[PDB]
Amino acid sequence: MAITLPKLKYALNALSPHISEETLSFHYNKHHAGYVNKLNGLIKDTPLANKSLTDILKESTGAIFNNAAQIWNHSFYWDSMGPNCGGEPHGEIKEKIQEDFGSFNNFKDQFSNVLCGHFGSGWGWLALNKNNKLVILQTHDAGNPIKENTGIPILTCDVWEHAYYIDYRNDRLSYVKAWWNLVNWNFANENLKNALN
Amino acid sequence: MAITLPKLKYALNALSPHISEETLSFHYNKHHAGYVNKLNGLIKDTPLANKSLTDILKESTGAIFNNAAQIWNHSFYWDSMGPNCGGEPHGEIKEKIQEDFGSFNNFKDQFSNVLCGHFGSGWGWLALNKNNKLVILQTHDAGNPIKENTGIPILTCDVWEHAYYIDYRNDRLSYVKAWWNLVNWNFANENLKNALN
Ligand SMILES: [Mn+2]
Ligand SMILES: [Mn+2]
Ligand SMILES: [Zn+2]
């Protein structure tokens, strides 16, 4: 089985007006697909040729790692959002956030601050750390908490300029605000359950 | 004198269709201006408050350096381009590129390769090294050859996504091709002459 672009769990216009169908079209069909295509080009006729994405992520370095990790990161980004989502958390993730951050609003303010403050290309993460505490992390470029052994990812938000430039230009703040309307708490709950078990 | 945004030496539509009017307006009036404004905000009421950009570049770290460096980098980028420019080099820079790269075409293909393969936010540089040889360099985020002590800058091209996303989206290759129509060989000659003297 060749490594492939996993399917979005919703339509290309499903996140609008918060993220436009045009953005998803480029972000998914050009950027995300391109990472898959480029990785497959790089590993062809190498000892990594028949490896799974998981194996590649563990073993590889350089541009091979960068493309592989971007594939994984973008799939986690799509899964971290959806239609008829956003708002206040619910379920276990509501308990866990209010516990570890005091309140949802405290978390949301800190997470927004990190997303808005990140310099250059990268990612913001909600993750569960080794002490089973929720933490906010940020990574540069293709970095993530799995590769960096800093925690188990629960949610992520992309802050590469290509994630928002079409809809928001330089106004990353407006993008981050829009993103809270999309956050998939069901995905967070599933990741949290699996992370604790 | 407070640190200020240097004036552009050309109109905001002087580089179209290679770089659009809209790109210059966001890139200069929002991004570059923003680095000036953020720098000035950060040094206010600190020991760096009344320092010049030059002083701040040699002393500072973290966000302060990032903003200061980006101010310098963008000013260098605007000066590296112009209307009625582009094409084959001329003057001393022609001789120098011919010698150090064998030909203009070899330099151009290498520099294009470096500009296109750079992962994440960054810059490509033509620079004079300590052996008075021209070299191709790349830096991440706000990095530049002065800070990194790797060479004296001659020309630069911005490859942060915001430099090209408005006009080309993910197609950095088209942006890089367009940029060769803009490269200011007169600036390259002035830089090379000051660097050798
Ligand atoms: Mn992305
Ligand atoms: Mn820029
Ligand atoms: Zn032209």
**Vertex A119: Cα angle to A116 and A121 (nearest 5):** 100
Most A CBs within 10 A among B170, B171, B174, hence the mutation to make, goes to B170
- On whether any CB of chain B is under 8 Å from the CB of A129, the answer is no
Distance from CA of B170 to the nearest CA of A (A): 7
Tokens representing B130 are 């300590």
**Is residue B99 classed exposed, middle or buried when 0-12, 13-18 and 19+ CB atoms within 10 A define those classes?**
exposed
Between CA B181 and CA A168 the distance in angstroms is 28
Which residues in B lie closer than 8 A to residue A172 (C-beta atoms)? none
Ligand 2 center from residue B7 Cα (angstroms): 16
Residue linked to tokens 């367009």: B178
Residue linked to tokens 């604790």: A196
Residue type, B147: K
Beta bridge partners of A124: A138, A157
Q: What φ, ψ does residue A126 adopt, rounded to 5°? A: -90, 130
**Is residue B10 classed exposed, middle or buried when 0-12, 13-18 and 19+ CB atoms within 10 A define those classes?**
middle
Inter-residue contact B140 to B122 (CB < 8 Å):
yes
Map A80-119 to HEC letters.
CECCCCCCCCCCHHHHHHHHHHCCHHHHHHHHHHHHHHCC
Ligand 2 center from residue B73 Cα (angstroms): 8
Inter-residue contact A172 to A116 (CB < 8 Å):
yes
- CA B118: distance to chain centroid? 15
**Vertex A19: Cα angle to A183 and A190 (nearest 5):** 20
CB contact under 8 A, A162 and B165: yes
Which residues in B lie closer than 8 A to residue A141 (C-beta atoms)? 119-120
Comparing CA positions, the residue from A88, A90, A99 lying closest to residue A132 is A99
Residue type, B164: Y
Between CA A70 and CA A172 the distance in angstroms is 20
Which residues in B lie closer than 8 A to residue A170 (C-beta atoms)? 26, 30-31, 34, 162
Contacts of residues A33-42 at CB distance under 8 Å and 24 or more positions apart, as own/partner, are A33/A5, A34/B170, A35/A67, A35/A68, A35/A70, A35/A71, A35/A74, A36/A3, A36/A4, A36/A5, A36/A67, A36/A71, A38/A63, A38/A67, A39/A3, A39/A64, A39/A67, A39/A68, A39/A71, A40/A2, A40/A3, A42/A67
Ligand 3 center from residue A45 Cα (angstroms): 41
Tokens representing A57 are 């992520």
Domain ranges of chain B: 1-197
Residue B156 DSSP SS3? strand
Helix (H) or strand (E) holding A141: none
Which DSSP letter does residue A30 get? I
Which residues in B lie closer than 8 A to residue A26 (C-beta atoms)? 169-170
Residues 6+ apart with CB under 8 A from A42: A63, A64, A67
Helix (H) or strand (E) holding B42: helix B33-43
Between CA A73 and CA A142 the distance in angstroms is 8
CB contact under 8 A, A162 and B141: no
Tokens representing B155 are 């020309």
Pairing between strand A152-158 and A122-128? antiparallel
Which of B:145-164 have CB within 8 Å of A?
160-162
Between CA A167 and CA B14 the distance in angstroms is 25
Tokens representing A176 are 């981050």
- The count of other CB atoms within 10 Å of the CB of residue A183 is 22
Tokens representing B174 are 């088209």
Ligand 3 center from residue B86 Cα (angstroms): 7
- On whether any CB of chain A is under 8 Å from the CB of B116, the answer is no
Residue linked to tokens 């809809």: A167
Residues 6+ apart with CB under 8 A from A87: A181, A185
Residues 6+ apart with CB under 8 A from A119: B63, B66, B141, B142
